[PDB]
Amino acid sequence: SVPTKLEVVAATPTSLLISWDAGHWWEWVTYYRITYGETGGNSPVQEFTVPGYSSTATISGLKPGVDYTITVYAPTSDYGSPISINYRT
Amino acid sequence: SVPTKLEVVAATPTSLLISWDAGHWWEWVTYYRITYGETGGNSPVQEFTVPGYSSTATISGLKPGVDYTITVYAPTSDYGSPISINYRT
Amino acid sequence: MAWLILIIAGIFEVVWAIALKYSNGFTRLIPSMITLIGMLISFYLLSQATKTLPIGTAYAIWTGIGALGAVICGIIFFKEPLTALRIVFMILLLTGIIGLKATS
Amino acid sequence: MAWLILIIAGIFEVVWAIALKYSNGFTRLIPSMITLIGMLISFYLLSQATKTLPIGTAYAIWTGIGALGAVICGIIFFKEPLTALRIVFMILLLTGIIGLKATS
Ligand SMILES: CCCCCCCCCCCCP(C)(C)=O
């Protein structure tokens, strides 16, 4: 159900600007945890959180020319499956 | 009378470190509000609150060589008696 | 006036109480937010009322308004069975609140 | 087991009540902090005692102890009125609260 439509709004060799659809007011969660990592798995991933009143998020320090997986988790699994996309910088 | 002994611990052309006596643990308040402004007049007086678990506070952004008055208020003046000082940066 | 503040404190208490269950695990932003605000306001106005009112009376009337708002909302909104017992109990509660205000 | 945790939750209820009275409207640090932490404690221990005991009787005994002990310690510490009327109307009020929370 939420979040939906995770699209990379903008991109730079070393940075992505992503966004999602927070949904209707009764679907607005308190926070989304964004997780970005090399689309393979060199060692861990990388993760931060964003207040639920925000639908966009910037990601920096990415290796240029590398495909990354980017997931946007709701606080709990109740709201919906964690959406995620692939993008090569 | 909370607080007591308002003094400038450290100082700079542009900043003052002040401290006061929070009193006994039954005189401790939830917050102090500090005021400071040019003793001359000209303008109003700057203000900010500070957690009551803090006997000290720093005042930044000040004109060098100018004389400021600095008052320290309790939430109410039930046992309150606003203590003020003068300090020239 | 402190009694009016107390009534309003009970109101915000029941409001944050129900917005709390409307927030799942403190995750829905809007409900969690309503609860946060209503908690702050309920407890703030409750403290203000306690400044001039006896604690055993202010707390009791605050909890009573919480319970009465909870039931009134359940019956009205969330479809709750209105029994003779619950009627008698709301009557006892309102009588207690009113008689406490009436012996100021 | 959870019965005594419920009892303790009600004790911390009256604790944060009396601590709120001493805080003169969240102005005296320590009574304000006893209030906040006693809130958190009572709510957590209520969640504990309620994941076992019936929410009806759990809330009933919880708010009963809270309200009654608040009335008591008010009559005692802050030497609040102990009239025939006030006690009778407090009886009506607390019975109404205990009854409404014992039927949900
Ligand atoms: C979570 C506890 C309730 C919220 C704390 C409210 C703090 C307000 C402090 C009262 C300020 C006293 P005054 C006479 C300057 O308004």
Residue numbers in the entry:
A (entry chain G), B (entry chain F): 4 to 92
C (entry chain B), D (entry chain A): 1 to 104
Sentences from the paper on this structure:
Proteins from the bacterial small multidrug resistance (SMR) family are proton-coupled exporters of diverse antiseptics and antimicrobials, including polyaromatic cations and quaternary ammonium compounds. The overall fold and many of the binding site sidechains are shared between EmrE and Gdx-Clo, yet the two proteins have markedly different substrate selectivity profiles.
Previous structures of Gdx-Clo were solved at pH ≥7.5 in complex with substituted guanidinyl compounds. In order to compare the substrate-binding sites of Gdx-Clo and EmrE3 in equivalent states, we solved a new structure of Gdx-Clo at pH 5.0, which is close to the value for the present low pH EmrE3 structure, pH 5.2. Both transporters are likely proton-bound at this pH, minimizing differences in sidechain positioning that might stem from interactions with bound substrate. A comparison of the low-pH EmrE3 and Gdx-Clo structures reveals conspicuous differences in the hydrogen bond network within the binding cavity, despite the conservation of many key residues. In Gdx-Clo, Ser42 participates in the stack of alternating hydrogen bond donors and acceptors (W16Clo/E13Clo/S42Clo/W62Clo) that fixes the position of the central Glu, E13. We likewise find that Gdx-Clo does not tolerate perturbation to its hydrogen bond stack. Although neither S42AClo nor W62FClo directly bind Gdm+, both mutations eliminate Gdm+ currents in SSM electrophysiology assays. In Gdx-Clo, the substrate-binding glutamate sidechains are constrained by a polarized stack of hydrogen bond donors and acceptors that also includes W16Clo, S42Clo, and W62Clo.
